[PDB]
Symmetry: C5
Subunit: 311 residues, 5 copies
């Protein structure tokens, strides 16, 4: 079966629509998500047109094998989608109405710059390659773009699922290729990050600053070193659930900054002890007393600067 | 093939049933479970009618390809079910009795609010989409809904497997959809959490409170810090076997609360030492003596408050 | 093709056999194992009978598609087996001899009560569903049940592979089902657990008891706490390679008991120090001296009691 | 269908091209990467030639089954490529223009010698085996070799995707094989390694060197031992994300060198204490004072030597 | 299609050959490896013989479906191989020359006794089952057994790939089976284990022995305990990348031995302190002085004994 011939020299408009049934497995490291949805396609094939009076039927149903069907592919998929044709309906004028249900692992990159307070725009790119006979062009039927209310992405809030109505038409290997951009806007559920990593990470840091109320070098060493080991554990746990970014992230910045605070506390603890042994604890006292205000004030201001730069 | 034609204007009732053979792999992080079960379907196709006098047989057998079979799909599956048609039997009136055995990764969300003392209601949604010729409607044959006695879901107790007999009939992309809700009620076996996670977590917390019977700042720092690190390990181990919830969980609350208890013990240990050095151990003694009763009493009451809020 | 018709009203006996080629991947958490084996089936279809003098041939070979073959399934498999028909041979009387080679992920539960000194009975359940024409019943041909000598299950000793000759015949969805139980008896190779997990766990416990020969509260705190953190690592390592059991296991008991020993040592270390500070080291000495005998004696007796209860 | 016959006994030149759609999953340990791309093939089959004036058509489209298609196979793939024929076009002369879209897990080794400041050359090898009728030879059509702008490999910069135009023709099992080398040049984005692994690893090393300003053996033991445990965690974290190389890597060197610095600091801390106890702290002072300059200077020079050897 | 009939009563000799293309993923815990290779088969079928004069052709090419092809299987594979027939050529005398390219997960056990200085012999077993018509026997065509030069097994050196020319002919389920043994000899690249696991493990042990030059019980406890924890981390990192063996391994022995050295050092540290407190440091001094020579000497001799027993 060949593509429907043009009346004049017009391209064949294939109207598309994606209706999300299930959205799942959003992998941050892999920058992938899984989607189970309906794909609807509609085009006019005049060869399939009929008289409802003569045929007695208002709609004719066909098996895929029986008629010409446009080769639609997804651009950003790991492997080609698992599809099951649900229905093919031909109206009397020849307007084919194709519907299939598919599942695909979509590969769409994420911007971790504001993590875990980030929002994302996931993309699903539909594509058709023109044939020799005639050029195929994609269109969006907004009445057939959606998601069911129950669609739930674990750990994310689904804001919108819309399509960019104007396709990106371009040459690829001397043939036209009509590309459509379906956008799924999601925003991260940061609630858990607060009681789970943020607050515990801050408490173990504040526990380290109790060394500013102690003269016991042995206890201070223990305090600042032990908490630094706890911070290493947090920093490992955080970074292992994120991909290696060529840009600095908000969480990355915070984690790095905290390492400097530990390093500078070790230096303070060291200086204080050196002076006490040198029989000059008056200098050590003034240094320690300053640190009690300095460390929190600088930490607080540095965070204000950081949050400001990132948001 | 086309769907069986209506005698009058009635929809085609497809009677369904699911009989669970093996229900396994319930993944808490993924909020998915695997199921291997029988799917039974029964509908009338008068076209298939026969005389057993002429045909010789009292029941006719068919290959799926040979007759019209309703396109039944699962709503909440990762990928389309792996099915194997077990049997297709047509009685003289044209009543079809279809049976297949399938396997599926069902994606049904869990409520972790009372974890590990939570119960769940897993869902398996059956759906049929109406055709142009006639409307298809799902029904439940309760004689064909069940589970074998041996069905075991590791670390869960299977309470019931029932179906919500009245289907959810609704429009979707200008066609009728008949949706059935199969409910598998399970409850978590929390036994292991007690000797494994709970009691060890409580002993290492009580071990830290022995610092209320010591004056050695160096030993107290060691005690409270070391046990804090043990609790960091605990919390990570617990937290990595749960998904990131936008709501606070019972275990999450307990774990968070325990972090405050360590932070407040570090403060007590710090205050006690400061006073000892300040040559006023009478204040330090009274503060420490209070802490011995305070810490357990407050911990016990806080837990009573927490358990109350969550159950 | 319909099933072979009965001479009288007898059921069709399908003789079965499983000959294990490879046994691998016994996952303890998942309570699954992978199997690669031959499945042999034999039944009499008189329609296929021939004269060996007239046909010249002793045996006729058929393609599966050509003749009626009973739909045999495995009950306890994750997904349906990957089979390849090796041979179909028909004798003059009409005795069909079918042979296929298959692979499957069997889901058979384990009893962790005596782990790592446990033995298991893995099950492979064969099942046939009766048809409307006639009832199919399974049988065991013991001459076709076995395993090759080289079958090796890593970290397990294969004792026997036998079949329970009497099938479990029962009604399921108003049709007869004939179920056969194939039992693979294995016993765990516990050797490695001794130099790997057991002895190191016991040494780090005995290391903590050296605090009974020390008066240094700071050194005892260090000793008992450090060894406790090592035990936490041991316990996590052990329990992450086991599923969550609703029953107490031998290893689980030992691990929990050891936790108590650390808690009670912390108490001893605390009491000894309190008394030393209270200027009464005579009581502290007698308490410590007792602990030196008490701790090992109690540990040894508690283990005798435990081993007795579990074996 | 047999291969096209030669006019004069020349080999059949199959012109090839690979246009990368998506690059993903570069696994360093596995030395594998995944690709989704277009594969274009073009050859002359005179049997397929037609008249364009008489036939009215300038191009004829065929189903793969209809014509002879050269068996093109990737050398370095885990399993054979998933492919979907996009189009087959025949020009009047009989020039076939085949296009398929495929996915493959390519196995191309990496050189970890300069990690994480390394660049790589990934390979995709195309191969054709000659037939008895005639020899098939591969060629590169540079106008059909490329990648889309959006191709992104997470944590890697894509430099170029080119082909080595001259095929490696050789005998294999008494038949000619024509092999083509497609090269994808990538370079690691090392940015993240600096705030994440490098700077933290250097700070915990510098923290250990504060023991050169302390006389407290107990505090020095704590300092050097604790920071050493931190380095063990770092080194384990780094080494588990790399394969076992028979050559020394840049990071491997750095990590190993750092272990010696900790061993030599333990020795210094030990010597200093021995002398202090031996009532000769003048020697201990001079040894410690030297170490303060020695340790950083030697560390800095050793790194200059190392970086020089590796780059 | 039936098997070729015998001229006399001779068995049908199927000549085989395996030429390795890519050898990857050798999993130590699983005792498996992946292989991608050519499988060549050749047998005489006189029914296929032809006159090269009357046919004009010197070789006839067939589709698998067209002719009889022996059912060749691999014994030790997880699931049946993924094959693609490359070519089927019939010479005038009727000699079929079949060639396919396949991929398989071969399950061949490893001997970890000398790990990481071990060598292995991986096996690939080819098998054919005899039919009632005639008994099929495998043979090795040494000209068709090999590997390409580029075959690389990450972290292993490929020594040889040979076949044991004499097949193991035996009865299995009342039919003969002809089994061939293909042996791939590999040896582990132990280089990395030295800077990575061995030297760091030895240095953290030597760091513990500095407690023989200290009188500070608190510092010795810290030293011997901290290092013991580092050895636990090592011992896990090692053992988790190895399967549970019923035999003692070289690395297992070394690791176990080192645990005794830590236990005995804790005992020494304990005894030394007890005596110091007992106001008899002359005994403590002589015990400590002995330990300084004893510990390394015994460690060195124990290793010589161990290496001797294992190599
Ligand atoms: C250690 C540092 C502690 C973390 C501080 C919060 C970071 C922040 O300031 O987060 C800010 C984000 C909101 O960002 P947004 O509105 O979605 O971005 C859009 C921004 N525009 C205007 C640039 C487009 O989250 C919050 O509401 C913060 C609530 C969490 C508080 C946790 C405190 C502990
Ligand atoms: C009497 C002193 C009470 C101290 C209360 C501590 C408040 C911490 C609030 C954290 C809020 C989040 C930032 C934490 C610093 C640790 C404080 C050390 C206290 C030293 C006691 C001196 C005794 C006179
Ligand atoms: C540290 C915190 C200690 C944990 C306290 C147990 C939590 C609890 O009280 O858990 C309660 C759950 C039962 O809940 P349910 O009946 O299934 O819920 C339905 C409840 N409604 C419908 C009436 C609201 O388990 C138990 O029987 C508790 C046994 C575990 C005791 C562990 C002691 C240590
Ligand atoms: C810490 C405690 C150390 C563990 C002590 C061994 C437990 C035990 O007693 O184990 C018992 C099992 C034997 O099991 P079985 O004979 O097959 O049981 C069947 C018994 N019936 C049918 C009579 C009921 O193993 C052994 O022979 C123990 C060898 C390992 C000793 C390691 C010591 C270190
Ligand atoms: C007055 C002393 C100031 C100390 C400044 C420390 C600079 C650290 C530079 C890190 C560069 C990145 C190099 C790590 C050694 C830390 C030195 C500890 C200070 C000793 C204090 C003696 C008090 C008189
Ligand atoms: C002057 C002392 C020099 C110390 C040199 C140490 C050699 C270590 C060689 C490692 C072999 C690889 C085996 C390591 C033992 C630690 C030695 C403790 C030194 C005690 C110093 C006493 C001060 C007088
Ligand atoms: C502890 C050691 C700290 C690491 C020091 C950097 C290693 C290095 O010197 O790295 C060098 C590489 C660049 O290598 P290249 O130009 O791509 O190689 C081609 C070389 N030719 C000429 C041989 C062909 O990266 C950099 O630009 C270094 C930036 C990171 C600095 C991190 C400092 C903290
Ligand atoms: C002179 C005393 C030698 C002690 C040898 C220790 C035997 C341990 C055998 C365990 C076998 C497994 C149970 C281990 C207890 C630690 C013993 C502490 C010794 C204290 C020394 C007091 C000096 C008089
Ligand atoms: C902790 C103790 C340090 C480890 C000692 C090495 C073990 C050994 O001596 O190993 C020996 C193996 C060689 O074994 P093979 O030649 O393949 O066996 C053939 C044996 N015959 C003769 C019985 C057939 O490795 C080596 O070449 C040693 C290099 C590694 C040295 C690392 C030292 C640090
Ligand atoms: C589960 C949660 C509270 C948690 C446990 C342990 C450690 C950390 C980091 C913050 C150090 C953490 O996120
Ligand atoms: C997760 C479970 C197996 C576990 C093991 C050992 C100790 C703990 C405490 C410290 C939380 C624990 O939670
Ligand atoms: C490899 C082996 C000796 C090992 C190392 C570290 C800890 C454990 C036990 C204590 C769980 C262990 O099994
Ligand atoms: C360097 C090494 C010790 C390390 C520990 C913990 C966390 C990180 C990053 C996230 C800072 C890290 O790379
Ligand atoms: C002691 C040994 C098992 C070990 C510990 C930490 C780091 C490494 C390498 C990466 C140096 C290592 O293999
Ligand atoms: Cl697609
Ligand atoms: Cl489906
Ligand atoms: Cl099955
Ligand atoms: Cl391929
Ligand atoms: Cl096979
Ligand atoms: Na079509
Ligand atoms: Na059908
Ligand atoms: Na300490
Ligand atoms: Na059949
Ligand atoms: Na073809
Ligand atoms: Na084809
Ligand atoms: Na064949």
């Amino acid at each position: 079966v060949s593509p429907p011939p043009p009346i004049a020299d017009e391209p064949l408009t294939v109207n598309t629509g994606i209706y999300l049934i299930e959205c799942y497995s959003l992998d941050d490291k892999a920058e992938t998500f899984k989607v189970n949805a309906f794909l609807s396609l509609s085009w006019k094939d005049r060869r399939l047109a009929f008289d409802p009076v003569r045929s007695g039927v208002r709609v004719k149903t066909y098996e895929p094998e029986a008629i010409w069907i446009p080769e639609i592919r997804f651009v950003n998929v790991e492997n080609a989608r698992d599809a099951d044709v649900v229905d093919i309906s031909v109206s009397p004028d020849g307007t084919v109405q194709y519907l299939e249900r598919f599942s695909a692992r979509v590969l769409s990159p994420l911007d971790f710059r504001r993590y875990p307070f980030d929002s994302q725009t996931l993309h699903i790119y539909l594509i058709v390659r023109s044939v020799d006979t005639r050029n195929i062009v994609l269109a969006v039927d907004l009445e057939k773009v959606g998601k069911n209310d129950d669609v739930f992405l674990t750990g994310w809030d689904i804001e919108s699922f819309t399509a960019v109505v104007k396709p990106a038409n371009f040459a690829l290997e001397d043939r036209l290729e009509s590309k459509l951009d379906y956008q799924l806007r999601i925003s991260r559920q940061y609630f858990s990050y607060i009681p789970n990593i943020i607050l515990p990470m801050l408490f173990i840091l504040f526990i380290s600053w109790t060394a500013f109320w102690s003269t016991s070098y042995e206890a201070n060493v223990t305090l600042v070193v032990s908490t630094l080991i706890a911070h290493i554990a947090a920093a490992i746990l955080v970074e292992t659930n994120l991909p290696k970014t060529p840009y600095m992230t908000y969480t990355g910045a915070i984690i790095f900054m905290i390492y400097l605070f530990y390093f500078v506390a070790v230096i303070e603890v060291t200086v204080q002890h050196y002076l006490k042994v040198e029989s000059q604890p008056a200098r050590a006292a003034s240094i320690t007393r300053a640190s009690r205000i300095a460390f929190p004030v600088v930490f607080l201001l540095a965070n204000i600067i950081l949050a400001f730069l990132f948001f």
